[PDB]
Amino acid sequence: MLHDNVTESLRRITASGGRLNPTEPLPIFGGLRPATSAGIARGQASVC
């Protein structure tokens, strides 16, 4: 976008509708790995 506070607001918003999203502070260089959880109930979660 043109303003950063909008690209940040979009990410913060969409970080609340699911559990697959990057960690809060961005990595400067890498792959943006999600924060691993502690429980695995039924099986590998199929991403839609």
């Binding site: 990595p27 890498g30 792959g31």
Partner: protein, 316 residues
């Protein structure tokens, strides 16, 4: 007898199905270290985000871009010396052989987006020497290629790291042994320049060359072969590289120690000792050879005993 080493790496920067045995392989450090290193080593008035862009745009189009961050258990570890040579083939004085090398290695690898990977690597090296994070500090000598096993996008190399070269039994086509060989574009020997031209023992050095002039960076490496020891070799090359040293040192009560020539601003070359040739006199043959479908000239050494203690000697 000797000593072997093993490493599993990706095959993005190197394909042992294409290198012939006896080619030198180089090892890389993790690219993530460059971030903090340039964060604390860049010169005042200069932003290292150009290095960040170089690295990031490089690794965006080399292989699977993910995993290259911190959680990397598998990585792009080894690179061929011929590779790092042909991505900078625009600075070696013997143009025609280097140009043949470049076109051959652009056609012999995957065929797709290597022109991309090559200039990515060239731009990355340019940026690092520009932000005062030198390549010699991140690239080391691994060994000489002996035997390999490949798969889909992954390799397993075993190379000679110590001892005589031709004491290594391999299951090749022709003969159980193999000799070392280097591309003919990087072969620069210090001895005939200084004209001592004497038989006997000769060391083999791995020397980089730095030309940092603003927006006109320059990085190239050769494989020296001289009679000099590791002490006075620095003096010798510093001597026949006078212009580069000059244009580098010149354009690189309150004290006011500002804008003075510093060590990283005045640096032009760094070298390491990697082996030796304890023969009666060294013979080497420049014969044109085939990389699959193309022909490129190489240097065929004989009787090289690989050395060690990988400590870099600097020259500013």
């Amino acid at each position: 007898t000797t000593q072997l080493i093993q490493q599993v790496s990706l095959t993005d920067f190197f394909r042992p199905d294409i290198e012939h045995a006896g080619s030198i392989v180089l090892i890389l450090r993790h690219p993530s270290d460059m971030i903090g290193e340039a964060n604390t080593l860049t010169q005042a008035g200069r932003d290292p985000d150009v290095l960040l862009e170089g690295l990031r745009n490089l690794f965006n189009a080399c292989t699977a871009p993910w995993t290259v961050g911190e959680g990397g258990g598998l990585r792009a570890y080894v690179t061929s010396l011929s590779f790092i040579a042909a991505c900078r083939a625009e600075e070696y004085t013997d143009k025609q052989a280097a140009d043949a090398n470049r076109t051959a290695i652009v056609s012999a690898y995957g065929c797709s987006r290597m022109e991309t990977r090559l200039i990515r690597f060239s731009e990355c090296l340019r940026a690092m020497v520009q932000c005062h994070v030198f390549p010699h500090r991140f690239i080391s000598f691994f060994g000489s290629l002996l035997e390999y096993t490949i798969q889909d996008n992954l390799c397993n190399i075993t190379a000679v790291a110590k001892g005589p070269q031709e004491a290594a039994r391999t299951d090749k086509t022709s003969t159980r042994r193999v000799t070392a060989n280097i591309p003919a574009c990087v072969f620069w020997d210090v001895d005939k320049d200084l004209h001592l031209s004497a038989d006997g023992l000769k060391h083999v050095f791995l020397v980089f060359v730095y030309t940092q002039r603003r927006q006109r960076e320059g990085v190239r490496l050769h494989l020296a072969l001289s009679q000099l020891n590791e002490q006075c070799f620095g003096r010798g090359i510093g001597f026949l590289l006078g212009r580069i040293r000059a244009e580098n040192a010149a354009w690189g009560w309150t004290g006011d120690f500002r804008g003075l020539p510093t060590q990283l601003s005045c640096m032009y070359a760094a070298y390491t000792l990697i082996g030796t040739i304890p023969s009666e006199s060294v013979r080497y043959t420049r014969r044109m050879e085939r990389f699959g479908g193309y022909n490129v000239p190489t240097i065929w050494l004989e009787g090289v005993v690989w050395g060690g203690t990988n400590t870099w000697n600097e020259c500013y």
